[PDB]
């Protein structure tokens, strides 16, 4: 069931590369994004999907050095050890066009775009979990933005929002608590 | 399958009140939110779920008059005709607390909260579609915010982000197009 699918999606930090069918994984990532709703069907989400050598390169040659250079002013090995990383961007050129076409909603499009990024990120995350793969969501933007755009020749208009690290599950999700229903749901008739 | 569940979720404007098991619907809405991820497990989403007399009141006594008063400075009947409306808020008190606790990420929490709102909105939307119910997402915020908070005695900290109108499907979804894969997915190794 759908609710079961949602419950199955969890943050998994212990990831490996025991992935049987990479093509199936790629297909599923694309489908999850494809069937995600966006304001005005604007489809502002953009993905860079890295595996193999590119996965090694992201973490060893971009994230690590950028992070070090920043801090000055382990975990990374665990991210690198995963099968791949899905970098989620929002296309600002489309956002700006929407703002120009529908001036009435100009202030709203950045908001709906952020919402869109969350939407496709978790739909992909949940779809991967259905395949039995784990993932965790990271935010090394904006530190790595320029290096990533240069290495993989991305349009300047792609604004990095998140990085979903994914692979085989090598240890179970941790414990998680939930709010009291009474504090977040009100039902009225 | 999960991808099938995603594909089944569509914007349905023609909605009615042929809903067989309201309690099951409420349970499913709660579960979809419960099992949705949020930054720091902050669970900032808040829901006001209206049906029956409250559904009539929202659209006739709040949205209509506010909208008229604004414009001065049909569709509404179609929204009212639905079984209910799920109003999605983000709790700004929790957001502000996060900003204070983790000053390093202060600018990020509003962003992750917006992403969170998108996340729970579509998870609820998709869960309703699995039950065979249709829905559409509207944005009469911030116009109706104050009236809604007063009528249902909501905390000032609840910031309205969207209103998901839902009910029985009375006409099929319209046609929808998709981008070229090549323009939004890059795969590298
Ligand atoms: C963040 C967001 C905001 C949306 N806002 C509205 C809205 O205010 N009014 C409306 O009728 N539809 C709204 N939509 C629905 C989209 O237009 C719709 O999802 C998109 O055209 C894809 O069609 P589908 O929902 O049938 O898949 C919104 C969707 C998203 C994801
Ligand atoms: C918008 C958003 C941003 C998140 N950012 C991070 C992050 O930067 N690093 C991380 O390790 N987890 C991150 N998480 C994961 C959440 O902490 C996690 O989803 C939450 O604690 C619930 O746990 P679960 O994913 O196992 O259900 C993020 C989740 C969401 C929805
Ligand atoms: O009809 N509308 O005004 C409309 C349609 C579709 N989407 O996505 C919208 C999104 C935001 C505001 C109005 C929208
Ligand atoms: O191996 N990791 O990357 C890792 C393990 C455990 N926790 O809690 C983490 C938390 C945040 C980022 C990476 C983590
Ligand atoms: O370990 N972290 O830094 C971490 C854990 C969980 N969430 O949700 C985070 C979210 C944003 C930034 C860092 C996060
Ligand atoms: O009945 N409606 O509310 C309705 C019908 C058709 N479209 O396209 C709509 C579009 C936006 C809002 C309401 C709509």
Annotated binding residue at A161?
A: no
- The single-letter DSSP state of residue A11 is B
Taking the C-alpha atoms of residue B68 and residue A62, their distance in angstroms, rounded to an integer, is: 54
Q: Name the 3-class secondary structure at B158.
A: strand
- Structure tokens given for A16: 């490996």
Please state which CATH number belongs to domain A1-189. Answer: 3.40.109.10
Taking the C-alpha atoms of residue B126 and residue A70, their distance in angstroms, rounded to an integer, is: 41
Taking the C-alpha atoms of residue B185 and residue A100, their distance in angstroms, rounded to an integer, is: 25
Taking the C-alpha atoms of residue B140 and residue B40, their distance in angstroms, rounded to an integer, is: 29
Q: Which residue is associated with the tokens 């961007």?
A: A89
A vs B, Cβ pairs < 8 A, gives: 158
Other Cβ atoms less than 10 A from the Cβ of B142: the count is 10
Closest residue to A54, CB basis, from B7, B33, B189: B189
Q: H/E element holding A188?
A: strand A185-188
Taking the C-alpha atoms of residue B168 and residue B172, their distance in angstroms, rounded to an integer, is: 11
Q: Name the 3-class secondary structure at B155.
A: coil
Cα distances (angstroms) measured from residue A32 to each of A55, A73, A115, A121, A177: 21, 39, 15, 9, 27
- The single-letter DSSP state of residue A16 is E
Taking the C-alpha atoms of residue A146 and residue A158, their distance in angstroms, rounded to an integer, is: 10
- Polymer length in residues for chain A: 189
- The single-letter DSSP state of residue B60 is I
- Structure tokens given for A164: 């979903």
Closest residue to B3, CB basis, from A121, A127, A161: A127
What lies within 8 Å, CB to CB, of A77 at 6+ separation is A59
Cited resolution, angstroms: 1.5
- Structure tokens given for A173: 């999700």
DSSP string of B119-149? HHHHHHHHHHHHTTEEEEEE--TTTTHHHHH
How many Cα atoms are found within 13 Å in the side-chain-facing hemisphere of A2?
25
Q: H/E element holding B160?
A: strand B158-169
Q: Where do breaks (C to N over 2.5 Å) occur in chain A, by preceding residue number?
A: 73
Taking the C-alpha atoms of residue A22 and residue B8, their distance in angstroms, rounded to an integer, is: 25
Other Cβ atoms less than 10 A from the Cβ of A32: the count is 23
- Structure tokens given for A71: 């801090």
Closest CA to A105 of A113, A1, B51: A113
How many angstroms does the Cα of residue A11 sit away from the middle of ligand 2?
A: 7
Backbone angles phi, psi at A158, to 5 degrees: -75, 115
Are the C-beta atoms of A134 and A164 separated by less than 8 Å?
no
Does residue B130 have a cis bond before it (omega within 30 degrees)? no
Q: Which of A29, A32, A118 to substitute to test the interface with B, most B CBs within 10 Å?
A: A118
CB contact burial A118-137 (16+ within 10 A = b; e otherwise): bbbbbbbbbbbbbeebbbbb
Closest residue to A119, CB basis, from B35, B46, B122: B122
What lies within 8 Å, CB to CB, of A4 at 6+ separation is none
Task: Using alpha carbons only, give the angle B103, A137, A58 rounded to the nearest 5 degrees.
Answer: 100
Say if B179 is an interface residue toward chain A (CB within 8 Å): yes
The set of protein residues with a Cβ atom below 6 angstroms from ligand 6 is B 13, 75, 78-79
Domain edges within chain B: 1-189
Is B41–A176 a contact, with Cβ atoms under 8 angstroms apart?
yes
- Which residue's alpha carbon is at the smallest distance from atom 12 of ligand 1? B137
Are the C-beta atoms of B98 and B181 separated by less than 8 Å?
no
Three-state secondary structure string covering B61-101: HHHHHHHHHHHHCCHHHHHHCCCEEEEEEEEHHHHHHHHHH
Experimental technique used to determine this entry: X-ray
Task: Using alpha carbons only, give the angle A125, A131, A133 rounded to the nearest 5 degrees.
Answer: 60
Q: Cα A32 from chain centroid?
A: 12
Chain A residues with CB inside 8 Å of B136's CB? none
Cα distances (angstroms) measured from residue A19 to each of A83, A170, B107, B187: 7, 12, 36, 16
Say if B31 is an interface residue toward chain A (CB within 8 Å): yes
Chain A residue with the nearest C-alpha to that of B30: A185
Is B1–A130 a contact, with Cβ atoms under 8 angstroms apart?
yes
Cα distances (angstroms) measured from residue A152 to each of A96, A156, A185: 23, 12, 44
Closest CA to B92 of B124, B131, B44, B153: B44
The torsion defined by the Cα of A99, A105, A111 and A113, in degrees rounded to 10, comes to -50
Chain A residue with the nearest C-alpha to that of B55: A189
Q: Which residues are paired to A135 by β-bridges? A: A11, A166
DSSP string of A25-92? HHHHHHHHHHT---GGG---EEEEEEEHHHHHHIIIIIIHHHHHHHHH--HHHHHHTSSEEEEEEEEH
Annotated binding residue at B139?
A: yes
Phi-psi category of residue B43: left, alpha or beta, with phi > 0 → left and psi -120 to 50 → alpha: left
Closest CA to B118 of A184, A121, A138, A137: A121
What sign does the dihedral A174-A14-A51-A143 (CA atoms) show?
Answer: positive
Are the C-beta atoms of B84 and B72 separated by less than 8 Å?
no
Q: Which residues are paired to B159 by β-bridges? A: B90
Q: H/E element holding B146?
A: helix B145-151
How many Cα atoms are found within 13 Å in the side-chain-facing hemisphere of B154?
30
State the nearest Cα–Cα gap between A100 and chain B, in angstroms.
Answer: 19
């Amino acid at each position: 069931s759908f609710i079961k699918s949602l419950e199955n999606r969890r943050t998994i930090y212990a990831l490996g590369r025991n992935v049987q069918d990479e093509e199936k994984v790629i297909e599923t990532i694309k489908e999850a994004v494809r069937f995600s709703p966006t304001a005005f069907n604007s489809q502002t989400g953009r993905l860079l999907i890295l595996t193999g050598d590119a996965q090694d390169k992201l973490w060893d040659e971009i994230v690590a050095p950028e992070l070090k250079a920043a801090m000055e002013a382990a975990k990374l090995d665990g991210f690198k050890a995963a099968f791949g990383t899905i970098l989620f961007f929002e296309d600002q050129a489309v956002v700006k066009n929407l703002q120009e076409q529908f001036a009435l909603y100009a202030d709203n499009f950045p908001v709906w775009s952020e919402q869109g990024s969350g939407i496709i990120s978790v739909n992909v995350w949940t779809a991967l979990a259905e395949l039995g793969l784990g993932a965790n969501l990271q935010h090394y933007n904006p530190l790595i933005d320029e290096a990533v755009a240069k290495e993989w020749n991305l349009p300047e208009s792609w604004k990095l929002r998140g990085q979903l690290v994914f692979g085989s599950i090598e240890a179970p999700a941790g414990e998680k608590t939930f709010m009291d229903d009474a504090d977040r749901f009100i039902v009225a008739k």
